Enzyme design. Structure first.
Site, mmCIF file in Angstrom:
data_model
loop_
_atom_site.group_PDB
_atom_site.id
_atom_site.type_symbol
_atom_site.label_atom_id
_atom_site.label_comp_id
_atom_site.label_asym_id
_atom_site.label_seq_id
_atom_site.Cartn_x
_atom_site.Cartn_y
_atom_site.Cartn_z
ATOM 1 C CG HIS A 282 -0.364 -0.234 2.506
ATOM 2 N ND1 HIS A 282 -0.301 -1.496 3.062
ATOM 3 C CD2 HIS A 282 0.184 0.606 3.417
ATOM 4 C CE1 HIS A 282 0.277 -1.423 4.248
ATOM 5 N NE2 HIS A 282 0.578 -0.158 4.490
ATOM 6 C CG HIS B 40 4.450 5.837 5.152
ATOM 7 N ND1 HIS B 40 4.563 5.628 6.509
ATOM 8 C CD2 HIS B 40 3.260 6.452 4.958
ATOM 9 C CE1 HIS B 40 3.478 6.088 7.110
ATOM 10 N NE2 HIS B 40 2.673 6.591 6.189
ATOM 11 C CG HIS C 189 -0.227 8.529 2.465
ATOM 12 N ND1 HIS C 189 -0.966 7.386 2.672
ATOM 13 C CD2 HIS C 189 0.480 8.738 3.604
ATOM 14 C CE1 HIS C 189 -0.721 6.922 3.888
ATOM 15 N NE2 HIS C 189 0.156 7.720 4.470
ATOM 16 C CD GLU D 211 -3.164 9.522 4.337
ATOM 17 O OE1 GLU D 211 -2.520 9.438 5.404
ATOM 18 O OE2 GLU D 211 -3.898 8.611 3.905
ATOM 19 C CG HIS E 290 2.355 10.404 7.015
ATOM 20 N ND1 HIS E 290 1.230 9.677 6.685
ATOM 21 C CD2 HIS E 290 1.994 11.707 6.946
ATOM 22 C CE1 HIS E 290 0.229 10.505 6.441
ATOM 23 N NE2 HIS E 290 0.668 11.744 6.582
ATOM 24 C CB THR F 125 -4.156 7.795 7.662
ATOM 25 O OG1 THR F 125 -2.923 7.433 7.032
ATOM 26 C CG2 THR F 125 -3.981 9.081 8.487
#
Ligand SMILES: CCOc1ccc2nc(S(N)(=O)=O)sc2c1
Ligand SMILES: [Zn+2]
Length: 257
Positions: A61, A91, A93, A103, A116, A195
């Site tokens: 993911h 990591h 997003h 996010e 993050h 999250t």
């Protein structure tokens, strides 16, 4: 299993993780005119000079850069925090397009990606214990906008070819996370959650006001990763972000006015 597709995406997660509809879920929209300046907030203390990166992993993911957290090597303190939080991984997003991917949002504005840096409170002894506590984690969130390249990010970008598919990992030593920080450390902070599942409500969020810039070429290489494992049908790893959740009974505090 959960993911970011039409049939298993964020709007489905509550069926397996009821805490998805909880009272302190993340991410949230940061309304800059409703955030309260708190002069009692201390400056952040980031001590990353002794950081030891070990590995980079495609976990299906996102991709994680993992650190040695067996000693106080790379730690976060100060700000809204009490005590010492150890860096364990970072990591990102990101989106399929430059206009989405973060996010958190700021006055409903989306950024191209969000970094993050995940830390856990050392008083709880290990990360798995920490996630079960209301003050167990501190995640530092940094927005990415598309513009000039970020030199300190390129070593991450160049290794992504080797971890294209889920479950692949590569040795990733001597990476200095200080190259990913903005100039200013002014921040908003609020109590929130992981999250992704298990969505535990264990996080003190610290979101930096100043974004970093990365080039279109750099973010383009994020978008070539795969959600799937090797030898499975190709699904591009894009839009691995959860949409903003209700603020409910929380107030966002700012370290700056
Ligand atoms: C507990 C198993 O490890 C996990 C699970 C979810 C999770 N979400 C985040 S984030 N996106 O920084 O809020 S870090 C993290 C670590
Ligand atoms: Zn994250």
């Amino acid at each position: 299993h959960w993911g970011y597709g039409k049939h298993n995406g964020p709007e489905h997660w509550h069926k397996d993780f009821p805490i998805a509809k909880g009272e302190r879920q993340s991410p949230v929209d940061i309304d800059t005119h409703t955030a309260k300046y708190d002069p009692s907030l201390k400056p952040l203390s980031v001590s990353y000079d002794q950081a030891t990166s070990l590995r980079i992993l495609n976990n299906g993911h996102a991709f994680n850069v993992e650190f040695d957290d067996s000693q106080d090597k790379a730690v976060l303190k100060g700000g809204p925090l009490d005590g010492t939080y150890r860096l364990i991984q970072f990591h990102f997003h990101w989106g399929s397009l430059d206009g989405q991917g973060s996010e958190h949002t700021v006055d409903k504005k989306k950024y191209a990606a969000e970094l993050h840096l995940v830390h856990w409170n050392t008083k709880y002894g290990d990360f798995g214990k920490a996630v079960q506590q209301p003050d167990g984690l501190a995640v530092l969130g940094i927005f990415l906008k598309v513009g000039s390249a970020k030199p300190g990010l390129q070593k991450v970008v160049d290794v992504l070819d080797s971890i294209k598919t889920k479950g692949k990992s590569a040795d990733f030593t001597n990476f200095d996370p200080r190259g990913l920080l903005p100039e200013s450390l002014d921040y908003w902070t609020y109590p929130g959650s992981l999250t992704t599942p298990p969505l535990l409500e264990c996080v003190t969020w610290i979101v930096l006001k100043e974004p970093i810039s990365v080039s279109s070429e750099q973010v383009l290489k994020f978008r070539k990763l795969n959600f799937n494992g090797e030898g499975e049908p190709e699904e591009l790893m894009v839009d691995n972000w959860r949409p903003a959740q209700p603020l409910k009974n929380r107030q966002i505090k700012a370290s700056f006015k």
